[PDB]
């Protein structure tokens, strides 16, 4: 039945994305430098997330610390010691009243910021890889046992379960309309899920190795995936095919984090070669190089109104770029 | 008081040594997730045994990049699953994020190996000790030592041991091996070699 799917995908392929963006003006060289440097963590930084107020962010390190940073003044508003030292993700609530984390303990820990712990969601089997808030009462998590789940924070029970992946789920991204989300996993595939229904919609198979990060385009109709085959790929939900492939003949390392800008023009990809790249999403050409980390760049995030880009690496340092 | 109270915690992060415990089901690594803290010569070692996840280990093992040492426990008496243990040792030795972490190798279950001798690998016939139990022990040890000296000898080293089920001096060996593991780190950090 997949032969008919591939035949329909070939029949719906008229012209490439780079042909539609062929005779357009390129951005050119992107020059960015570090404005603020945060140094308050001992072990490697594994994850971060920005606030919706575009000022405060959160960061998670392998030493057992979750620190809320004020990006403007390089000050620590809060610092939380964690019961488990290994945390793979952290999310900061859009209302700012709660924070979440999780990792190798297979528990999603949610703390109140009125700092006290509020809830411990315990239903997963494998290592919890990503989590994102929908509201103060619902949360979407993904774990390493090839599952995702939508949880109610009040009763502490799973509301829906998403079981379609054959590999360990590495990342998830939420749509701006909060009606769909995407998940990238370790079977070289990404899946689109409906929050309200609870069933998979579409499956995208264009990569060749384990997909580590995923992020929606700002219009909600496209996404980008970075994987261990040293290539990024841009997919569309309507065209049912890979729109773009961002590759190079000199990159032989994996991809750890991708994120989009405010307009979606620049794709910000973190690599294992101690540096990040700034690709053009339309021209499929590299336009910027950010090299300020002495170890592997683990996490990357974009300010909600596009004023800054904050990266965190395995050299225990957070760097904000403008 | 966020900045001051963190700094004392840094002293705690300078006080303990983290260890990664690995082994198969037949190997008695619980006798040699679960956390075990033990103190030798007023130095705290904190070993982690991970068993709450699946059998795919290529994505969470990167959480143990800054670990001091990997204690790898091998049941020597199991000739059927010895090749799987050798393949696991080869995978941990040749990993990209584990290429700077030294492995303390514990060849457990010596008494059952001696009973199997006194009661798979075709190269055992043309072997000589560097008295059958000694030949079997050093053949099994050199099977791992060939993988250890095949590549990556400069960045990290292997420390084999022979251990029975009634042995109590394993923490002594872990102390001494971690002391040499960082001693060689400090000799290169301090511009001496």
């Amino acid at each position, epitope marked *: 039945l997949k032969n008919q799917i591939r035949d329909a995908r070939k029949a719906c392929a008229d012209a490439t994305l780079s042909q539609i963006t062929n005779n357009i003006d390129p951005v050119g060289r992107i020059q960015m430098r570090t404005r603020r440097t945060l140094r308050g963590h001992l072990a490697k930084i594994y994850a971060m997330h920005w606030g919706t107020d575009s000022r405060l962010l959160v960061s998670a390190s392998q030493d057992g610390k979750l620190i809320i940073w004020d990006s403007y003044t390089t000050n620590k508003v809060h610092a939380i010691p964690l019961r488990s030292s290994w945390v793979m993700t952290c999310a900061y609530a859009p209302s700012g009243n709660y924070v979440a984390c999780g990792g190798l303990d297979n528990i999603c820990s949610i703390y109140n910021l009125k700092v006290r712990v509020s809830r411990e969601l315990a239903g997963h089997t494998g290592y919890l890889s990503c989590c994102r808030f929908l509201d103060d009462n619902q949360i979407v998590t993904s774990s390493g046992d090839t599952t995702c789940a939508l949880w109610d924070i009040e009763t502490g029970q799973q509301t829906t379960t998403f079981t379609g992946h*054959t590999g360990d789920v590495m990342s998830l991204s939420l749509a701006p309309d909060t009606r769909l989300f995407v998940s990238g996993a*370790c079977d*070289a595939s990404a899946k689109l899920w409906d929050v309200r229904e609870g069933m998979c919609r579409q499956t995208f198979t264009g990569h*060749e*190795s384990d997909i580590n990060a995923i992020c929606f385009f700002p219009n909600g109709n496209a996404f980008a995936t970075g994987s261990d085959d040293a290539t990024c790929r841009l997919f569309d939900l309507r065209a049912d095919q890979e729109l773009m492939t961002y590759s190079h003949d000199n990159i032989i390392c994996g991809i750890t984090s991708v994120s989009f800008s405010k307009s979606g023009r620049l794709l910000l990809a973190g690599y294992d070669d101690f540096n990040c790249n700034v690709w053009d999403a339309l021209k499929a050409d590299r336009a910027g190089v950010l090299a300020g980390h002495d170890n592997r760049v683990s996490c990357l995030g974009v300010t909600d109104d596009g004023m800054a880009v904050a990266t965190g690496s395995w050299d225990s340092f957070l760097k904000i770029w403008n | 008081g966020i900045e001051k109270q963190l700094q004392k915690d840094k002293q705690v992060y300078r006080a303990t040594h983290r260890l990664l415990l690995l082994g198969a089901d037949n190997s008695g690594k619980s006798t040699i997730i679960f956390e075990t803290k033990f103190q030798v010569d007023k130095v705290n070692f904190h070993m982690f045994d991970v068993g709450g996840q699946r059998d795919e280990r290529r994505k969470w093992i990167q959480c143990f990049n800054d670990v001091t040492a990997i204690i790898f426990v091998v049941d020597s008496s199991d000739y059927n699953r010895l090749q799987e243990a050798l393949n696991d040792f080869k995978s941990i030795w040749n990993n990209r994020w584990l290429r700077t972490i030294s492995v303390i190798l514990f060849l457990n279950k010596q008494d059952l190996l001696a009973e199997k001798v006194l009661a798979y690998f*075709p190269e055992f016939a043309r072997y000589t000790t560097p008295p059958r139990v000694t030949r079997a022990k050093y053949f099994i040890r050199d099977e791992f030592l060939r993988i250890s000296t095949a590549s990556g000898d400069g960045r990290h080293y292997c420390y084999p041991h022979f251990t029975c089920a009634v042995d109590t001096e394993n923490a002594r060996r872990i102390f001494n091996d971690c002391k040499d593991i960082i001693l060689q780190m400090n000799l290169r950090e301090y511009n001496l070699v």
Partner: nanobody
Amino acid sequence: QVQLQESGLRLSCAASGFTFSNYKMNWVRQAPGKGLEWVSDISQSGASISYTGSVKGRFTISRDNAKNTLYLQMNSLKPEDTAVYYCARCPAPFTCFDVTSTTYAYRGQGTQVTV
């Protein structure tokens, strides 16, 4: 979408969906009633070749990057060699843990061999 299809005495593994010259290729059996067991491995350029000691000197493993296929030439077989055979690829290019795993996405469906 990656794809590995086995056929098969000489076993063949045809590869699709991925570039073939940048991955190390492995052969893994599964005996009836036993677990998955690693058999042989070959590197990216075909330089480093390793076998299990049970089949050392009896099996040969080769690759064809022009045809993008993996051959196992097996002869002087034994009744203990009756197993289901899979060709495995480990995911990181230019490098390899979980090829002998219970649920692995980068290996084929395998072929039955009865001696």
